[PDB]
Write a protein that binds this ligand. Sequence first.
Ligand SMILES: [Cl-]
Lengths: 294, 288
Amino acid sequence: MRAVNWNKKEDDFSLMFWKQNIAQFWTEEEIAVSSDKNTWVQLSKEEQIAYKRVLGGLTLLDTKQGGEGMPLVLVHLENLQAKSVLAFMGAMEEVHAKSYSHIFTTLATEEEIDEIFDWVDTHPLLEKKAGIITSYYRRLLKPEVTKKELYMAMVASVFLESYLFYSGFFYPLYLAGQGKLTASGEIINLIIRDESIHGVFVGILAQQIFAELSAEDQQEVQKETQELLMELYEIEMAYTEEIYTSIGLVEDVNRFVRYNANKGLMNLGLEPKFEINPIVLNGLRTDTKNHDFF
Amino acid sequence: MRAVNWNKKEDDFSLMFWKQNIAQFWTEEEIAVSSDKNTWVQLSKEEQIAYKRVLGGLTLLDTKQGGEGMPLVLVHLENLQAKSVLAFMGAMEEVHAKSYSHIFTTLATEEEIDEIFDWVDTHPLLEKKAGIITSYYRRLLKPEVTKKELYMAMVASVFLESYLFYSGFFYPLYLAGQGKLTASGEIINLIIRDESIHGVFVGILAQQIFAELSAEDQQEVQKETQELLMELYEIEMAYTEEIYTSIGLVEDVNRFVRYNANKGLMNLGLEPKFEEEEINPIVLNGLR
Ligand SMILES: [Cl-]
């Protein structure tokens, strides 16, 4: 039975991503959020509700990625060095989720927070969105998986990390780019810096598996991938209408969703399928690599 | 579908263990090991081989715990706060494995290191003991698991983290207690500080799942747990004989194995099964 041996590279990139994930390590206690209250109270009722709801949705996606996606993808990987990186990435998803709770504690009452998490649990679009992704993960709950099944779980992972978060990330970035809730904006930037490298790494692993598939299986997963992309897009368009219509931002968020869907495709080695709001860009500007990335 | 909500406690202990695991965070780059070369070269070849072999075995157990044990136990937990803790613990198992490679790079040539890992992969006792543990994990590769299956995977996890490591941890602690390889000894101590809290936490979870079983299921897993303990003991005694006979420490390591088996049992809420003894005082000084 093999032990991970870092003296003998198993691939050309796992060490670099291990080191970068470690270098980017942070926890919920490094960014104090209390100073955001001065601009929180200046938001309208409708803007506060949108902010809290998008944070709830972001929390759900991190919960599923750290607790189902990374574990089930990594257990079936044969590359022990890449397994190591994914295990660390899954732990950082849990750090991300906990950081949203830290934001909530500062900006909302105990009762308001619990109302948001009840709204998340019963929300039909969030349940549909997360169910679509996790179906590909739950297919891996068996002793032996095919490369097609593993590939499609990695696709789902890239789409969650590079794409599905961004209808939610929009709003903390939009406010921060206006000087509002900048400390929470710093946290979201740290989260984005991690998710960006997560999506690149899983996308590399997916491309390696894809090349190992038969031509017939390649054509089948290409179709499934394009269908999944658009299935999620339909749900995201319903979600942006639900969240952002009250505050006038639906079309802006949709452009941002498409931008990040294209990024997810590129992480998988695929061409863009869709043809960034400047205030969002300014809210990314606090992190040099985020602003360059986007 | 539920998102983790740390505002509303799911149990009385996950937040405390979350905070402690974060507080204990460290990586491979924080302890420079090159100063150990001065005492490494004073060891005989037999001592050096034993050290490298036991680190190879420790690396195998971390590989399986981070890459199979924690993932498969956590995926079936309903408690999202406890899931969070386990995901972090699994990542730290991978950090531990990477730290052993850091020690290897300092103390051995590239060819020597690859020889150790080939020795690990083809070792029959390491394959057997790892296979016994991972059999309980692999039973969780299905959409729905029973609480009996989850309990026995948690038992296997506590036995690995609180017990099976210690036939290997012995020798770095013993040498460090004598002033030898003390930088590597500092790393092993950081690893032990993590594994100790891992075993306590998983043991708490196991006791919770146990209380949720029918009496019939309780009687079954109680017996399976005692049998597993002693099946692993028989393998560990073969392993200590193989590793430590050359350097005269077999009976010393066996005492330490029994001590830590008892700790694993107590982490599960179970009574000790081996003669309760004082820890070897040289090892105690290596923990100091
Ligand atoms: Cl296949």
